[PDB]
Paper text:
The human CD1 family of antigen-presenting molecules (CD1a, CD1b, CD1c, and CD1d) is structurally related to MHC class I (MHC-I) molecules with the key exception that CD1 proteins bind lipidic antigens. Recently cloned TCRs, termed PG10 and PG90, mediate autoreactivity to target cells that express CD1b, and the response was augmented by adding micromolar quantities of PG.
For the PG90 TCR, the affinity ranking is PG > PS ≈ PA > PI > PE > PC > endo. Although the serine moiety in PS is similar in size to glycerol, the NH3 group might provide electrostatic repulsion within the PG90 TCR pocket.
Numbering used by the authors:
A (entry chain B): 3 to 101
B (entry chain A): 4 to 282
The structure:
Amino acid sequence: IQRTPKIQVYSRHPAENGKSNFLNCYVSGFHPSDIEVDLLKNGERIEKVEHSDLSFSKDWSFYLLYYTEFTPTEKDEYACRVNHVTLSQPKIVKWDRDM
Amino acid sequence: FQGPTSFHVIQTSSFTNSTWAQTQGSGWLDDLQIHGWDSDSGTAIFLKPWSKGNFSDKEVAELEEIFRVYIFGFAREVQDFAGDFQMKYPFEIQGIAGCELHSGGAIVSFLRGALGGLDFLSVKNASCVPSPEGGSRAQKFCALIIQYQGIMETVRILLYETCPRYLLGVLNAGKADLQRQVKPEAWLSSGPSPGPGRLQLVCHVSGFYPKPVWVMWMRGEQEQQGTQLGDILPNANWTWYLRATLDVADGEAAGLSCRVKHSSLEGQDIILYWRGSGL
Ligand SMILES: *[C@@H]1O[C@H](CO[C@@H]2O[C@@H](C)[C@@H](O)[C@@H](O)[C@@H]2O)[C@@H](O[C@@H]2O[C@H](CO)[C@@H](O[C@@H]3O[C@H](CO[C@H]4O[C@H](CO)[C@@H](O)[C@H](O)[C@@H]4O)[C@@H](O)[C@H](O[C@H]4O[C@H](CO)[C@@H](O)[C@H](O)[C@@H]4O)[C@@H]3O)[C@H](O)[C@H]2NC(C)=O)[C@H](O[C@@H]2O[C@@H](C)[C@@H](O)[C@@H](O)[C@@H]2O)[C@H]1NC(C)=O
Ligand SMILES: CCCCCCCC/C=C\CCCCCCCC(=O)O[C@@H](COC(=O)CCCCCCCCCCCCCCC)COP(=O)(O)OC[C@@H](N)C=O
Ligand SMILES: *[C@@H]1O[C@H](CO)[C@@H](O[C@@H]2O[C@H](CO)[C@@H](O)[C@H](O)[C@H]2NC(C)=O)[C@H](O[C@@H]2O[C@@H](C)[C@@H](O)[C@@H](O)[C@@H]2O)[C@H]1NC(C)=O
Ligand SMILES: *[C@@H]1O[C@H](CO)[C@@H](O)[C@H](O)[C@H]1NC(C)=O
Ligand SMILES: [Cl-]
Ligand SMILES: [Cl-]
Ligand SMILES: [Cl-]
Ligand SMILES: [Cl-]
Ligand SMILES: [Cl-]
Ligand SMILES: [Cl-]
Ligand SMILES: [Cl-]
Ligand code: NA
Ligand code: NA
Ligand code: NA
C-alpha cells in the first residue's frame, strides 16, 4: 500500500506585506520515498529553495521540509507543488495568510 | 538537561528492478540532522563543526568505511536473495538504529527495519526479532542473518558499545547549538468556521527552540479544555512552529487569550488577547 503526501504550507513569521519572511512547505505521510517538491511564485518555480534530507516518522511514512526566503505582497501568490507515484499530476497547495 | 537525548542513523534503500538499487542515509540527534550521506560516493557529510563528537578522524573514517561497505553490500545481498524471498519490484526497505539517554542515566539502544512501509524486524538483546507484519519473510530473514556471525557481532558493537560513547561525546561537542534557547513569537488569526454559529480562533507560535512548549487558550487564569494542538511543524534553522486552535460561538470569543510558556521566556509567559469586531 502506497501513501499519498500531506502538504502543509506556512510562513515562519506572520505575513506583513513588504517584510522579509520564510515560506515553508512540509510534505509528510507519504510512501514510497521518491517525490518531487517545488515552491512557486505566481506559478513559476523558485530556484533558490532549500530542503531537508529525507526522514521518516514512527509509522515509516516519509517527510521533508522545503523552504525559501520570501517577501509577501498584496498580489504575489505562493504555492507548493508536489508530484509522487500516487498522483496523476502534481498536487498544488497555495499559501494562504488567512488559513 | 535540554535538547536532543538520542542519536540515530536512518537508511532508505529503494530497489527499482533487478539491476538498479540506491540507498539514502543520514544521522540525527532526535529531529536535528547532523550527518548526510552521499548515495553516489558512499561518503558521509558532516553538517556541523561538532558532528564528529569526541571521535578522532581515525575512528570517524573507520565508521564511514563500515557504512560504505554495508550500504553497497546490503543492496548486493538483497538483490541476490530477492528471488528466494519472492520479492516483487519495486520495493523499499527502511532501517533506523541508534541509542538514547534516559532519565537516571541509562543508555538504551535500538534497531528497527521495515519493508513496504510496514514493520519488518527489530533488535532486542543483540538478536534479530521478526515483526508480525513481516510474516514468514521476516522469519526467513532473521534465520539467514544469524548464520553470519560477522554481521551480528558488528551490529552488537555498534549498537551497544560505539553508539553510547558517540552519543555522549556529540551531545557535549554540540551543546552550544543543542542547549541554546530561542524565544518564540506568537500571533492570533481567524480559522475557517468549524460549524453553524461557530468561529475557529488560532494561536500561532513560531521560532522556538528547544521543542518542548506549552500553548493554551485561556479565560483569565482558566485553561480552555477545547484547545486543540496541531502537529509541531519544523522551521528552517532548528526551530519549530505550532498552532493551537479553539472552536467557540461568535458571542463567546470575547475574553479569550492565548498563553505561551517556553523555557526561553524565563517565566515571562507570552499572553495574546482576542479583541472582537476587527479590533
Ligand atoms: C567520548 O566520551 C565518552 C563519554 O565520556 C564522558 O562524558 C563526556 C560528555 C565528557 O564529560 C567526558 O570527559 C567523559 O569521560 C567516553 O566514554 C567514557 O569513557 C570513560 C573513560 O574515560 C568510561 O569510564 C570507565 O568506565 C568503566 C566502567 O564502565 C562500565 O560500567 C559502567 C557503569 O558503571 C557502564 O556505564 C559502562 O558501559 C561499562 O559497562 C570503569 O571501569 C573505568 O574505570 C577506570 O578508569 C577510571 C578513569 O577513567 C579510573 O578512575 C578507575 O579507577 C578505573 O581505572 C572508567 O570509569 C565511560 O564508561 C565511557 N562511557 C561510555 C558510555 O562508554 C569516550 O571514551 C572512550 O571510550 C571508553 C569506552 C573508553 O575506552 C575510553 O578510554 C575511550 O577514550 C570518549 N571518546 C570516544 C572516542 O568515544
Ligand atoms: C562518528 C560519526 C558516526 C557516529 C557513530 C554511529 C553509531 C551507529 C549506531 C548504530 C548503527 C547500527 C549499525 C547497523 C548496520 C550494520 C553494519 C554492518 O554489519 O556492516 C558490515 C556488513 O557489511 C556487509 O557485509 C554487507 C551485508 C549487509 C546485509 C545485512 C543486512 C542486515 C542488517 C540489519 C541487522 C539486523 C540483525 C540484528 C542482529 C544483531 C560492514 O562493515 P565491515 O567492518 O565488514 O566493512 C569493513 C570496512 N572496515 C573496510 O573494508
Ligand atoms: C539475552 O542475551 C543473553 C546473551 O546472549 C542470553 O544469555 C545467554 O543464553 C544463551 C542460551 O541460549 C547462552 O548461549 C549464552 O551463553 C548466555 N549468555 C550469558 C549472559 O552468559 C539471555 O538469556 C539466557 O538464556 C536463557 C535460556 C536462560 O538460560 C537465561 O538464564 C540466560 O540469561 C537472553 N535473554 C532472552 C533471550 O530473553
Ligand atoms: C531499472 O531502474 C532504473 C532506475 O529507475 C531505470 O532507469 C532502468 O531503466 C531500469 N532498467 C530496466 C531495464 O528496466
Ligand atoms: Cl525573516
Ligand atoms: Cl532560500
Ligand atoms: Cl543493484
Ligand atoms: Cl518468503
Ligand atoms: Cl539496550
Ligand atoms: Cl515499498
Ligand atoms: Cl496578534
Ligand atoms: Na527572509
Ligand atoms: Na511576494
Ligand atoms: Na495563517
